[PDB]
Amino acid sequence: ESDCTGSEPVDAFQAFSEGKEAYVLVRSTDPKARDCLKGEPAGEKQDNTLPVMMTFKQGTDWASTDWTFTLDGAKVTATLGQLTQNREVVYDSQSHHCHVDKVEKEVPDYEMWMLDAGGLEVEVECCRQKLEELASGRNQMYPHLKDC
Amino acid sequence: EQTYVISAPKIFRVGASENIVIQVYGYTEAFDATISIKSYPDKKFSYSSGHVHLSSENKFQNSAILTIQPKQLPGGQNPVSYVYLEVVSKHFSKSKRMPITYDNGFLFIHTDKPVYTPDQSVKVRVYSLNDDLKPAKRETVLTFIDPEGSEVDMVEEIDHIGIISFPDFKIPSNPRYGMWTIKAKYKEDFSTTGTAYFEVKEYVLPHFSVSIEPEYNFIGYKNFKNFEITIKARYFYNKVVTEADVYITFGIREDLKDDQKEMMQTAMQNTMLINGIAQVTFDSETAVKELSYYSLEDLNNKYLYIAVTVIESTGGFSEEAEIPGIKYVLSPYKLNLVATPLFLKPGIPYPIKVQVKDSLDQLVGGVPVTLNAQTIDVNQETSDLDPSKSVTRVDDGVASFVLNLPSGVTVLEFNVKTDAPDLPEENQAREGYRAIAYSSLSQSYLYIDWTDNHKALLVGEHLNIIVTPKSPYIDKITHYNYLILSKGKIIHFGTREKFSDASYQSINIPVTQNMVPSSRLLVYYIVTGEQTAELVSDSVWLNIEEKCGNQLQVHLSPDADAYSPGQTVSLNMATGMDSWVALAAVDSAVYGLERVFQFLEKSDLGCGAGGGLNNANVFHLAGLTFLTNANADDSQENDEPCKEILR
Amino acid sequence: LQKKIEEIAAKYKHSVVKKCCYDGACVNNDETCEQRAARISLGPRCIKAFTECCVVASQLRANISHKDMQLGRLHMKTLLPVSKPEIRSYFPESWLWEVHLVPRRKQLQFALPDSLTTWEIQGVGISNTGICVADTVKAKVFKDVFLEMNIPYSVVRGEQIQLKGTVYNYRTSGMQFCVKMSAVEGICTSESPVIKSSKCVRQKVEGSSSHLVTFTVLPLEIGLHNINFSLETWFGKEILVKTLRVVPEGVKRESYSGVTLDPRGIYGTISRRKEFPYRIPLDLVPKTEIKRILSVKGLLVGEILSAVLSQEGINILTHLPKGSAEAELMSVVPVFYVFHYLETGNHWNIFHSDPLIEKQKLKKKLKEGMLSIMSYRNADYSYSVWKGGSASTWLTAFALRVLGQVNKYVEQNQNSICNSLLWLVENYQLDNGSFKENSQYQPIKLQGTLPVEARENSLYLTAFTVIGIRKAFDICPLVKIDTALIKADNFLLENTLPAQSTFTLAISAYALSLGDKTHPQFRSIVSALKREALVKGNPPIYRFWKDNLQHKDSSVPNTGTARMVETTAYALLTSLNLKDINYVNPVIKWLSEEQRYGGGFYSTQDTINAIEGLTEYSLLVKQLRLSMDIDVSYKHKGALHNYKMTDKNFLGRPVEVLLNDDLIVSTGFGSGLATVHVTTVVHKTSTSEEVCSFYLKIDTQDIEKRIVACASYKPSREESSSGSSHAVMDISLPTGISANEEDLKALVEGVDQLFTDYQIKDGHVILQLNSIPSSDFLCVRFRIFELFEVGFLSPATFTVYEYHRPDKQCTMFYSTSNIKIQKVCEGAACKCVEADCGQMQEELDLTISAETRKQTACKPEIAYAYKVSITSITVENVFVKYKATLLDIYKTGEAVAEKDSEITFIKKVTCTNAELVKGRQYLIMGKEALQIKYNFSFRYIYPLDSLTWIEYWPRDTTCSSCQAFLANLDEFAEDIFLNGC
Amino acid sequence: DQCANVTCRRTVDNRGKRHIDGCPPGCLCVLKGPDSKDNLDGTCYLLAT
């Protein structure tokens, strides 16, 4: 119900709650999506870059890797050491409770992130509709349902 | 001339085994009689009945025990109030309307302590006896009423042995403070109630201890101008309070039950507590010139309330104390008659035994007593008797008098006073009394008395009673008849041969355990001839030692004036027969209580020391109704039991 | 002067309103008569009587004498008051209350209780021969010479306490004696053990008196420590066993973590493992252990089951004080819901013993709880929030709810319930169907302007009263109160939307859910409530509600509050009444994990409604078989333990987690649904990083010492200036400080009361209040006195908070002693203060032999050891923090710190010989450290205790002979890292 | 209408039982005052179905 049009134009920093909140991966078309993937700010906003700590679980072992995000409007160039990853937030809920990322590769994957603290259910459902539209029938992974 | 006398309790008690006596006279041939309790007024239903045989072997006297079963009575809207007592035989058939009560037995509520503080647990059990003083074994309902009149808990329990243990009542952490009431009742059949009280008070930590010690427990004429009061105070670490400020307010109080009091803002004297002790003197006369009163003739039996506030000087802390009331006493003595019915028998010396007690209701000895009397005969001619004087026997407290009055006297207005060598005339004890002559149309009177009553009758001894009748038709009386009652039941009855070679004759009565703690004796003879048979009767009240049927005794081994904490000790219980025993161990300081033998003889339907205005009144004041073909003229509306008169 | 008061008393001797004159004349040197009468509510006549007697009493008290004042207190204090039942002495519980079959003779032996009491033994025989009251026999248990000691409730570590006692001699003759103290390890005494318990110094007690006893001690270790006291006399020797409770410094703070175990994923996603990480909080008091308890219970209702069935206590809301009738009802809430579960689901076989006896016990405890509220009931069957206060519509409704639910298992007095319901509907229901409150009790603070706040509060009260009436209607089904229910239901239907808060929307939705569930407007309200739902996960693992509306506040809370749990509970119960089973599972999971060890939640209302939600859900769904192998183990440490949970036992006792490692609770393939709660208790030195919803200030003054504690409410966003709701002012008293209870009584007992209830519990003065103002400060003022002497007095805390919103709070430290300075401790009488803290080395001491500096460093006990330079000094509460720079690292046993990184040191402020100067270098070697996560990086803090070797280290070489000093210093510094001992 | 305004009453027969009357059928008696007094008076309330 309602209209799912929210946050126009899409700003990544706004979609990340200006680096004040942590977000969890709830849907992803990536078959290798890390279980219980959570991203939380690891530092202050210096220039266009921003430190982001990524926690996830392999088997029964919790792991954390440090990353740096380079934000340019809606685009995000994430990197750790030599590994680089290009993303673009293609949708952001009206209250910045959830957003839909598009990761670039030969077969571009689509992801849905939401506040670890929780989000307004109607907006969470709107992000879910956007992700189902972008995925267009592809198999979805649910990284948060992995006994986190 | 042939007569019959049926004796029953004044009132029938539902569920009680009521003993009905039948005594017939003039019959030489044996015959049977049916005594019956039936429904009123139709006699359609028979609550119970019994057959009694009357013969020479039987001396033509017999007894039958009837019982009104509770289940045989309807319930609720139109409950039974009356039943019919009926006697039927070959010779006669007579009935009478008898009232019934649904009060049967006794319910004693026993709580471990009388005062509780929050979070404490009240231990409570009920002792339940039936009308015959035996374990009732009836299921019992307890109700708890808080100081605001609310029924806040109810619990019922069945009774197996006569001792009913209830679960403990937990006092709430923040309860309604004040006077709580416990009400016991039976779940079925009966209207018996029991009642107990216990207070719930808020604990407040005291700073020090304050004690008030008056000069005496009573205020007489000697201390009406000065009454010494000593106020002490000490810290709870066993040291005397060095300096403090003492404020004392005085009031006049009507009775100790009512918390109302009239203060006296004139005697608010203030003093200093030094080294633990302070003292003041209260001028009663001067202070009671306020609030009217003025004289010592007033204030009598009223109380002096004392309030003291002590303010310790170092820490400024304050603690209060009070004496609830000191009774003002106008006379050191109180007078009361003992074993002297207020009824005259024309021709018989009339005895008066006065008794002197102090402010503690203790028999005072060596107290001279002066007796005055006015007499009124049938001609209304008043006569002032010559005063007599006795001295109180110090062995029994008794001061005895014997009075010889003219045969024509009808009313005796006698007054007794104390004659103490150190008391003013106001401070003497005085009591007035009126005695009316027994009325008989044949000038026929009976007077009984048993040697004498000191000491009290001990179970196992013997009661040597003297039976003196005064009448014409004397030497034609065949026999004497007697009924012995105790605790509202006719326990004995019979007949003794009259010796033609004396005026009086001793009837011997073995005093038994059935007669504890009190009994009543009714003796009567039948005047016969022409006109109509007449019953000439008299009765006496027998005070008997309070002796248990199954005596209980508890002892502590080892016996010592004081014990040490945690000491292992043995308690030895000994009873005459196999008996249940309910034990309790309470901190005596809670008492700063119950007596069963006195509350038990409320079932005695008799009143006074015996006697009566006529035969019917003699039977009535002894707690008896009777059925007779002889004259039965009684007073008006005489259906309820007598009420003990107060003065 | 006497006549000027005789007229007053005579004027109000028989006035109906007489006390208002009385407590008007009471002394109040802090407020004028008009300020005191401004709080009077009992009506207009009382204000004028109060004002008159207040003004006249104040005029007469000018230049009075103590005798005149006291005589005036005599005139007033007698004619106007009535009486109050109270007692100054305690009477111990009676004993031997038993019945025996006595076969003519029976002896029974026992032990007399430990008490000084004149006991009275009474026997009553019952037999077929009647009743026999035996002669009462006396038994006086008495001790003529005995010692007693007064040990305080708690003592803060480091405080020097004077323990006072008394020896009593009731003999008429004086005697010699000596008391000695038993030295325990943690308790530091100035003298030393001889052979090992103190010394016997012979004194004499005079006959029939007492003698004082004093022992000064200084606790160095936290916890309960046994101390014995021996009294010796020429006639014997007595030992008095005692216990001293030593408490840490700072504030206690308690956090909670919850996890639900669903191994087969019946109610949601599978949940077999969970890791509770060990994280050291920021301002943790040094050398204090982080305590944390682990509770694993069998069902969703398992925590409440364990709370009720285990009789070691227990209140599920111990952090909230007693006093209000609400507390007395909440005392019966858990027992009721346990009974409701056991009876409705027929689960009495859980008991291994006789279930009938257990049902008996719970029924009795339910009744016992039920009498507790009788005190708060008035003659007209209304209920008052505060004993003796005015009747409250709100509390009467709540009592009707709890009683109405309990009536199912313990039948209630129908006539009483009828009178209470009718008191509600006949007097305090308006024409529009709403209910109005009679008293000034404000249970909740709502947003909006004064008119909007009025609408909101009216809606809330109407829904609350409706819930109560519905819950108790079957006891007294009158047409009159059903009509009342219709009118109120209509008010709710027309006035709920548009909503002003998710809270009132939820409670209105639940109240209407108790009636006709087919009305269209009710369905609209339920839809609006669903629209506000928050979810964690997609598909959602959790579903909960925030009490603020989305269009007013879009931020999502990070931790739960009482309003959050209460809104979620109302919504859950509304959904259960609609049989909406697909929607509640994530809600049930959220409420279950928000629960707390003990069964309760944040405040009272959220607790009762959440317990009802969990219980009703547990009875509505199929009871699964319970069978798990639950293993709790540390990650990098040994396995703690494991237990097999079945329906036989699943309320197992908790277990304390001592080791400083991360915890792991795991289970294999199982059947059932268990709950795992962890309560972390820490002690913190500061409160600055906490949100304060009250301005606080507190001081001690000298009077012509008195505590003055003031608070003022900080309204939230869109909240009016009307002030807070039901509030609590909890003032911890310092060790050995005692409060004047008369001053507190005088502040609540009168018609001009400033506070509505007071109590003194465990060293705390707890006052309660209808409302704390926003416009101005409100101050409690009460005198204090020193009970026993205390040195190095640790500060105490002053906390005020909303009773129904404990999250709206403010905690502040204060001390009753001004005492500074702390320059030095002078020689001996000193080893106890300087016992457990570091001693600085002698400055430029050349006798330290370089090998003793290395052997001390290479000690396996010494964890870290390196050379630093101090940058800043700071004094925080009871401790001193030194900011230093890490120069050269010489040893690292445990975690590592970076070179030239910032390192913090901490020493107890009460330590002088470790005085460090800013800017100077020092060699510091010691044990242990604290690893904190500040901002986004690590930080290490090192305590300065005993066996911490510190030495001043100049950088240059112009220290005359200390040139050689630095030579050997640099000798050790060179040898340590080239060897690796 | 019926039990609109008729007083009701609670009383004690000679057996100790409590009985209520004054109340027409299909209604309930509501009694004011301390529940421990045997003699109480109140009014009738119409009761429902």
Ligand SMILES: *[C@@H]1O[C@H](CO)[C@@H](O[C@@H]2O[C@H](CO)[C@@H](O)[C@H](O)[C@H]2NC(C)=O)[C@H](O)[C@H]1NC(C)=O
């Ligand atoms: C304090 O007194 C208690 C009681 O005497 C002591 O406890 C006893 O200690 C002895 C050994 O010293 C044990 O054999 C007993 O079993 C203990 N009894 C109990 C009930 O625990 C205690 O040791 C004393 N404490 C000190 C510090 O002296």
